[PDB]
């Protein structure tokens, strides 16, 4: 019993990087983002919201990721 | 058994071999065959024609 | 253990088609070719 | 000039007219299986599969001799 | 049936065969030398 | 006697049973059963002349066609089900695979003396690294020789492995209640699929065997 | 002038068995050999050399390999 | 079997890194997306529902990967 | 004695990551079905079915990963 | 015998996560075979079934992964 | 007892990588940085607050993974 | 001795995840064959071998990692 | 209390390879100057600062990952 | 000594999976090959037999991988 | 204390692979220096000390894993 | 004890799996040579020596990783 925190506390380790990603995911959204406006610079306006959409519920994953974490850590 | 599953496997394996490659095997060469008979007929057509020409 | 009659038998037979093929098979095969081209060069 | 035409003239005169030495009836208890199965009409691929028919005995025959 | 033809292996594949023999030898002293495992 | 022995009977007659047979005595119009051996040996022809490409290149021709048939037979042998397989020993596959690395060696060194090992330099580097590239691929000098052989082999072992336990796994799942024959024909013809890629794991790495050896002959022979 | 009396009755002759005398779809490299020995001593000269490429073969006859 | 809640907890942990790969997925179908409108303005409203599509079933992947772990945190 | 239920569950949390690439790899379909589709719009109803084919098929591996899951669960 | 299948169950476990190739690999070559139907309209049912054919000519790799996740776990 | 702070040890040290993920995503931001100034140069002030945009919110998911990792520690 | 056929079989089990080599391999080598027949059709046959050799190389290393499996799990 | 430096000294084993995020991370960046510079030739002083840019702060993930590691070292 | 053999047993599973390296390597080298053989088609005995070369050296370094897997073991 | 430099042991064993994205990072870095002094060959004294600058500053990083190796092992 | 040579083969075995990405590096080393070449033949010269001063180099550092483990496998 004086272990399965402690199993907690090592499965709240190895839950983290779920969210390796999101680390490496919406950052290649802006990536896009980028070649979606240096190529075509009056677009700015049809991109922008549109990668934020594509950016938060990507992120979102990772926050579900880190959140189980956090619930596994307690 | 356990190796006449692998020969129902072969024999169904191989009636497909007869059903697709077999008869394609089989046209191709068909192809192959009419080449090689029809340019050999053809060089030694030209050839009498040629005994012709003296 | 057995290494020596599989390795035997093998090295037999790969000097055997190494024998074989050289001076029978490609060669009757050759003879084809060179038919099939003084038939057609003439 | 010369060369192609006697060539030609050595090519055309020993070559035999109708397809001579027809061979059409030879046998060594092993040709037989051959004309019927290997020669220009059939050359059909199911005499491999005869053959592969002996190894689906002998394989077969030797777990006959090995484990039954 | 068939017409032989001498082509040439002996003096052209001397290496192939060497090395036929010479890993038949080594295997033979490695399984007259290590089979006692 | 010996089964292996007898394998090789069979793989020899199975080669007599290619040119003789196949004989419709020396007719020149070249049948069907003489299109396929003409067909093998015009691509691999095809494949050494531009491999090696020099005026020395046939002299090896018969031998890169006799590593390949050898290849080419027996390993179509074992597609057989009641067989044992001929190449699945990493022992007789490994040997013929050393006996051609040091074939290769010794011809090297015998064709080119001091100087054979700048081979083991593909082009220019700077200096101070030079030493470098020569212990850098040390192992594929070598390794290149265990590799050759271990990769046919470890095919033929593995894809013979596989269909014993995949037909012995369609065995064992259907000794249990009558519905498992209900939807169970997926593995059936998974396996039937696996032999479609069993005939050419045998071919396709038969032809890779002549192909890196074939290399292997210009890196051996020629100096580049 | 004498020159054409055999020459033409010669030809005419030669023609003669040239549109009866065909053999081509079965024709067999043993009768060739029988009247043409050029075809085994190219071949096996060829091969002493090791000239195992057959040079303008591929032109007027397709290679039909794999590749 | 106070042992078997803390394996519980660690298998739950290492369940949550399987949505690296949505987590990664969803975001380059937006990306994709991006490089798509840029190319062509015009074709916007044809992009958009397919991108949303293979993303929103893309993102179930990654919610059955996190609902393997709740069923297993519980 | 409680060490095999337990060890069923850590193996189902190590097994989790067999749709990671699920996740992804699809997103690479509708990536290419985006980028199928800017660069050429007048062929989308006959690429479609073949990216929906891929699609289905490219996921029925991380199906066959997360069944192996589930009957490994029970 | 108790801390045998335990582990059998941990290694079917672990050798299913291989199939994560097979996922990524038919999905990138439907994604050049899209890539190729739609730069070139008249190719299409020349090398889809080449493609097909890249389809399940590697994706029974990954079946070995499981294969290995069907008898591990189960014999 | 003396077991917990070690498995807090070890469980800080496995859930200190998925940093690697904002490792390589600010960096394909740079990338994209470099391939927007360079094949259209008159564009920075549109893509260059943009791409520091990415950075900042990409690098800040992996600051949430060692941070997690250094709650975990102490 | 109990404890070892057990290490057999979960070092089968992490053995079994290099044929990923081969499964993410395979298939590039025919997507540059389907993106290099699609801008070139008549080189397809030119180019059939090329390719089905680095295939036949690449499922060949994938089945160097599951022999590891085997005579690890005979 | 004995387990506890070896548990540190795997725990600091496995959170050494997060500067793995550093070799593949700003090598990137240096593959984009490449063609930030051989698609543009006269543009290396303008872009070149932005790369060093894109280095420094970047190669944080290594930094903040092996001095964790040093902070489980001394600490 | 009932261990160090289960030990070495283990050590060859997760020894097994640095071919992951080889066979990615070698088919994106053919990747490439095919990729630029049908762009420039005349030059496919120039670069063909250095393809093969780097086929050769993507095997060498996916190779002490496996004799590590050897040599431990045997 | 018969179990310290064990756990050195397999702590360099687990430190040891984070040389893997150093190895890549390198390689490209002149896999872009190809594509780029290729295509643009009067670049290259432009290009190549920066390039391997942009080598060597990456190189060393890797360095750093493996030197955590050795502050593990002595 | 007998633990720490045991220790010894599993540090072995994940110490090898570091030159994973060395034989994906240098195997993209000789991709882009390829790529490189087969757009430009007369640049062979020129680049393969650099190629291969580029391969090399960024070889030899993930093989480092077997001595790593060699050093610690004798």
């Given at each position: 019993?004086?272990?399965?925190?402690?199993?907690?506390?090592?499965?709240?380790?190895?839950?983290?990087?779920?969210?390796?990603?999101?680390?490496?995911?919406?950052?290649?959204?802006?990536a896009?983002?980028?070649?979606?406006?240096?190529?075509?610079?009056?677009?700015?306006?049809?991109?922008?919201?549109?990668?934020?959409?594509?950016?938060?519920?990507?992120?979102?994953?990772?926050?579900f990721?880190?959140?189980?974490?956090?619930?596994?850590?307690? | 058994?356990?190796?006449?599953?692998?020969?129902?496997?072969?024999?169904?394996?191989?009636?497909?071999?007869?059903?697709?490659?077999?008869?394609?095997?089989?046209?191709?060469?068909?192809?192959?065959?009419?080449?090689?008979?029809?340019?050999?007929?053809?060089?030694?057509?030209?050839?009498?024609?040629?005994?012709?020409?003296? | 253990?057995?290494?020596?009659?599989?390795?035997?038998?093998?090295?037999?037979?790969?000097?055997?088609?190494?024998?074989?093929?050289?001076?029978?098979?490609?060669?009757?095969?050759?003879?084809?070719?060179?038919?099939?081209?003084?038939?057609?060069?003439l | 000039?010369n060369?192609?035409?006697?060539?030609?003239?050595?090519?055309?005169?020993?070559?035999?007219?109708?397809?001579?030495?027809?061979?059409?009836?030879?046998?060594?208890?092993?040709?037989?299986?051959?004309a019927?199965?290997?020669?220009?009409?059939?050359?059909?691929?199911?005499?491999?599969?005869?053959?592969?028919?002996?190894?689906?005995?002998?394989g077969?025959?030797?777990?006959?001799?090995?484990?039954? | 049936?068939?017409?032989?033809?001498?082509?040439?292996?002996?003096?052209?594949?001397?290496?192939?065969?060497?090395?036929?023999?010479?890993?038949?030898?080594?295997?033979?002293?490695?399984?007259?030398l290590?089979?006692?495992? | 006697?010996?089964?292996?022995?007898?394998?090789?009977?069979?793989?020899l007659?199975?080669?007599?049973?290619?040119?003789?047979?196949?004989?419709?005595?020396?007719?020149?119009?070249?049948?069907?059963?003489?299109?396929?051996?003409?067909?093998?040996?015009?691509?691999?022809?095809?494949?050494?002349?531009?491999?090696?490409?020099?005026?020395?290149?046939?002299?090896?021709?018969?031998?890169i066609?006799?590593?390949?048939?050898?290849?080419?037979?027996?390993?179509?042998?074992?597609?057989?089900?009641?067989?044992?397989?001929?190449?699945?020993?990493?022992?007789?596959?490994?040997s013929?695979?050393?006996?051609?690395?040091?074939?290769?060696?010794?011809?090297?060194?015998?064709?080119?003396?001091?100087?054979?090992?700048?081979?083991?330099?593909?082009?220019?580097?700077?200096?101070?690294?030079?030493?470098?590239?020569?212990?850098?691929?040390?192992?594929?000098?070598?390794?290149?020789?265990?590799?050759?052989?271990?990769?046919?082999?470890?095919?033929?072992?593995?894809?013979?492995?596989?269909?014993?336990?995949?037909?012995?796994?369609?065995?064992?799942?259907?000794?249990?209640?009558?519905?498992?024959?209900?939807f169970?024909?997926?593995?059936?013809?998974?396996?039937?699929?696996?032999?479609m890629?069993?005939?050419?794991?045998?071919?396709?790495?038969?032809?890779?065997?002549?192909?890196?050896?074939?290399?292997?002959?210009?890196?051996?022979?020629?100096?580049? | 002038?004498?020159?054409?009396?055999?020459?033409?009755?010669?030809?005419?002759?030669?023609?003669?068995?040239?549109?009866?005398?065909?053999p081509?779809?079965?024709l067999?490299?043993?009768?060739?050999?029988?009247?043409?020995?050029?075809?085994?001593?190219?071949?096996?000269?060829?091969?002493?050399?090791?000239?195992?490429?057959?040079?303008?073969?591929?032109?007027?006859?397709?290679?039909?390999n794999?590749?």
């Open positions: 019993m004086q272990l399965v925190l402690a199993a907690k506390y090592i499965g709240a380790g190895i839950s983290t990087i779920g969210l390796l990603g999101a680390g490496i995911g919406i950052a290649i959204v802006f896009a983002l980028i070649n979606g406006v240096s190529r075509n610079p009056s677009i700015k306006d049809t991109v922008f919201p549109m990668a934020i959409l594509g950016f938060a519920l990507s992120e979102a994953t990772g926050l990721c880190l959140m189980v974490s956090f619930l596994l850590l307690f | 058994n356990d190796e006449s599953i692998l020969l129902l496997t072969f024999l169904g394996f191989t009636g497909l071999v007869a059903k697709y490659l077999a008869p394609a095997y089989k046209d191709f060469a068909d192809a192959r065959m009419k080449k090689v008979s029809d340019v050999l007929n053809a060089s030694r057509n030209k050839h009498v024609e040629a005994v012709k020409d003296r | 253990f057995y290494f020596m009659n599989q390795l035997t038998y093998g090295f037999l037979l790969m000097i055997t088609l190494l024998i074989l093929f050289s001076q029978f098979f490609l060669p009757m095969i050759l003879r084809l070719y060179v038919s099939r081209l003084f038939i057609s060069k | 000039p060369a192609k035409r006697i060539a030609n003239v050595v090519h055309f005169y020993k070559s035999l007219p109708q397809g001579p030495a027809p061979a059409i009836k030879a046998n060594t208890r092993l040709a037989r299986y051959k019927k199965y290997f020669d220009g009409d059939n050359a059909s691929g199911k005499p491999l599969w005869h053959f592969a028919l002996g190894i689906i005995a002998f077969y025959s030797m777990e006959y001799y090995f484990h039954l | 049936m068939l017409k032989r033809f001498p082509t040439p292996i002996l003096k052209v594949y001397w290496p192939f065969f060497v090395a036929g023999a010479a890993v038949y030898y080594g295997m033979s002293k490695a399984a007259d290590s089979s006692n495992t | 006697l010996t089964t292996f022995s007898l394998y090789t009977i069979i793989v007659l199975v080669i007599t049973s290619l040119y003789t047979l196949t004989n419709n005595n020396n007719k020149i119009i070249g049948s069907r059963w003489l299109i396929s051996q003409e067909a093998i040996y015009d691509t691999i022809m095809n494949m050494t002349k531009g491999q090696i490409g020099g005026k020395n290149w046939g002299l090896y021709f018969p031998m066609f006799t590593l390949f048939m050898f290849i080419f037979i027996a390993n179509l042998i074992s597609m057989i089900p009641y067989s044992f397989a001929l190449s699945a020993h990493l022992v007789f596959i490994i013929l695979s050393i006996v051609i690395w040091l074939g290769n060696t010794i011809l090297g060194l015998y064709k080119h003396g001091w100087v054979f090992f700048s081979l083991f330099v593909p082009a220019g580097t700077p200096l101070p690294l030079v030493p470098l590239l020569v212990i850098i691929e040390t192992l594929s000098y070598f390794a290149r020789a265990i590799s050759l052989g271990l990769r046919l082999g470890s095919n033929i072992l593995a894809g013979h492995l596989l269909m014993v336990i995949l037909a012995g796994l369609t065995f064992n799942f259907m000794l249990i209640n009558l519905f498992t024959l209900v169970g024909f997926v593995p059936l013809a998974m396996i039937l699929a696996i032999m890629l069993e005939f050419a794991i045998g071919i396709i790495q038969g032809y890779v065997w002549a192909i890196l050896t074939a290399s292997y002959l210009k890196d051996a022979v020629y100096l580049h | 002038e004498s020159l054409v009396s055999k020459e033409l009755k010669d030809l005419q002759s030669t023609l003669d068995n040239i549109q009866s005398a065909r081509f779809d079965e067999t490299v043993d009768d060739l050999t029988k009247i043409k020995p050029e075809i085994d001593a190219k071949v096996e000269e060829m091969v002493k050399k090791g000239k195992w490429d057959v040079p303008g073969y591929k032109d007027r006859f397709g290679n039909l794999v590749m």
